[PDB]
C-alpha cells in the first residue's frame, strides 16, 4: 500500500517552489467550461450543437461502417459511427481516475508475466535494448516552446528552461551518483531531480457513442476509474467504477443548453515530469530515436500513406493489432531489464539510475474531481512506484516500442515461426536476427509505433500459422501474448490512416487512406481551444487553426466519401448558421496565413507542416522533427546548444 500525503505535508510541499505559478499548481482546483472551438464560437453554442446533432445522424445514416469480420475495412472507409462529436467539449466526465500506484497486481489478475517467460524472449528484449542504445549520434536537446518544467519551479519561460536544461546536463552525473548512494532527497534538493510527476488531466473529446436501436436514446461509452483507495492499493481494497458522462449537471450548474444525446468528454490522466530529470534523459532518448527512425526505419519510421502502403502491399497477410490500456500495464520488470542491459553495455551507472528512477517516481495527483485531489502518492525520498509508463517520461515513446515490438515479434515466433528459434541461440545471434527482423528483411514483419502496429507475413512457412493467429484473435478467447492483452483491431488502421482492403480482402490490392472520422474530430471537436488570451501563437496549443484547411485535401481526399462529407458538412452548417462553412473556413485560412509570416502565402510549407502548425501535438504521436520543415521547426521549438549536449552525451555512453 502506497504512502500518501496531503498537500499540507512537508513532503508534498517541497514539490512546489516558492513562487506563484508553482504554488498555484499545488493548489489548483477543478475547472470545467465551454471551449472556444473556433474564434468567437463556443463548443456548447446552441447552433454548433444543433449542427453536430444533425451532421452525425445524417452521416452515420447514409454511411454505415463498412467493416469486415476480421476488422479489415472496405467500401466507404468508415470504420464506425460519427457520433463521436456529440460531446460538450470542455465539460469533463466526473470523476477522473486516480493514477494507479502499482500495476503489479493489475498485471497478474490479467494473466501477464512478471518477467521474460523464456530465455529466448529474455534475449530478444535485451537485443532491442542493445540495437537501440548503441552507436548514438549526439544532437541538440530540442525544447518544446510553451511547455512547463513542472516540479519544482513550474515555469514555461524558454530562457529559464534552457538554463535548467543546461544546468541539468552538467550536474546530472553528480545527482545520479547521489541516487546510487540512496540520497534521493539530496539529489532533488540540489538538482531538482526526483520529487514527483504532476498529474494533469487531458481531454479526449471523441470517445465512443452508440445509438441503441432499442432505446432510441444515445449511449456514452462506459469508462471505469479508480477511487483513491483502489489506486493506492493497486486494486486490493477500493472499487473500480464507471464515471458519469451524463451532461445534465451542465444545465443545473451553468444553465447551459444540453441537447438530447450529448455527454461530457472522457478524461485520460497525463503526467508532467520534473524537467531537470527529463533533460539528461531527453539528451539520450532523442539520439536513440534517430538511430531507429533511420536504420530500423522499415518497422519504425512512418510518414506518408504511400510509405505505409508500400511495405504492406508486399505482405501476404496483414493483421492490425491493438493493446488494452497499454500504459497502466507496462511492465515494471522491462524497465529493470532495459536498465540492466544498458549497464552491461557500459552505460554510466549514474545515468541509468536517473533513468531507473524516472520510471519509479511518485506522482502528484491534482484535481480528479471537485473536492478531490491535492495528494502526493508514494515517497519521493525512496521512489518505488509501479505506475506503469508515465505519459511524460523522457523516453516514454521508446519505452513503449522497446516493449511492444519484441512482444509482437515473440507473438509471431510463438504462433507462426518456431523454425526461427534456432536463429536466436545467444546474445550475438539474437541481435543479428533482431537487426534482420527490424529491417523487415525477414519472412515475418512488423510496422509499429508502440501500441499501434500492423503485423505481416510474406509467403513462407509461417504464412499458414499467421492465418491461424488471425483466427485466434478473432475468436478472442485466448490471449496470444503472455506480456500484454492483445487483440485484433476492429477496423484496421495504422497511425491515423485506414487500410482499405477491397473485393479480395488481400494486402496486395489494399490501399491506405485517411480516417474520415478523424477530420470531423479535428474540425469540430478540438482537444484545446483557440486561446485568444495567449498572445504568442507559437505558445498556443493550436497556433494557426485556419492553416488546417489548406492541408485538408492533401490528407483526407483519399477517402471514398471525402467529397460527400464535405458536402454534408457544408449543408448542415447552413441549417444551423445560415453561413457557408467553406467560406467560414477559407476566411480563417487567409487570416492565419498572414499572421503566420510574422513568426517565420504557403507555397513553401508541406501538407504536414500545416497540420503541425494547426496542432503541434502531432509531434507527440504522429510525426517527428525530420518530417517537418527545419524552418517551421524553429517556430514551435528551440534547442539547447549542441556543444553542451555533445559533451554530456559523451559522458553517458561507452
Ligand atoms: Mn492499429
UniProtKB/Swiss-Prot annotation:
Cofactor(s) it depends on: Mg(2+); Mn(2+)
Keyword RNA-binding: no
Domain RdRp catalytic residue range list: 307-482
InterPro entries reported for this sequence: Cystovir_RNA-dir_pol, Cystovir_RNA-dir_pol_N, DNA/RNA_pol_sf, RNA-dir_pol_C, RNA-dir_Rpol_cat_phage
Disulfide bonds: none
Record has DNA-binding as a keyword: no
Reaction(s) this enzyme catalyzes, per UniProt: RNA(n) + a ribonucleoside 5'-triphosphate = RNA(n+1) + diphosphate
Positions of Mg(2+) binding: 451, 488, 492
Gene Ontology MF, one: RNA-directed RNA polymerase activity
One GO CC term on file: virion component
UniProt keyword list: Magnesium, Manganese, Metal-binding, Nucleotide-binding, Nucleotidyltransferase, RNA-directed RNA polymerase, Transferase, Viral RNA replication, Virion
Protein name (database record): RNA-directed RNA polymerase
Subcellular location: Virion
Subunit structure of this chain's protein: Part of the packaging complex composed of RDRP, P4 and P7. Interacts with P7.
Purpose of the protein: Rna-dependent RNA polymerase part of the packaging complex that packages the viral RNA segments, replicate them into a double-stranded form and transcribe them.
Organism: Pseudomonas phage phi6
Chief localization: virion
Pfam families named among the record's database cross-references: RdRP_1
EC numbers, comma separated: 2.7.7.48
GO biological process assignments: DNA-templated transcription; viral RNA genome replication
Segments traversing the membrane: none
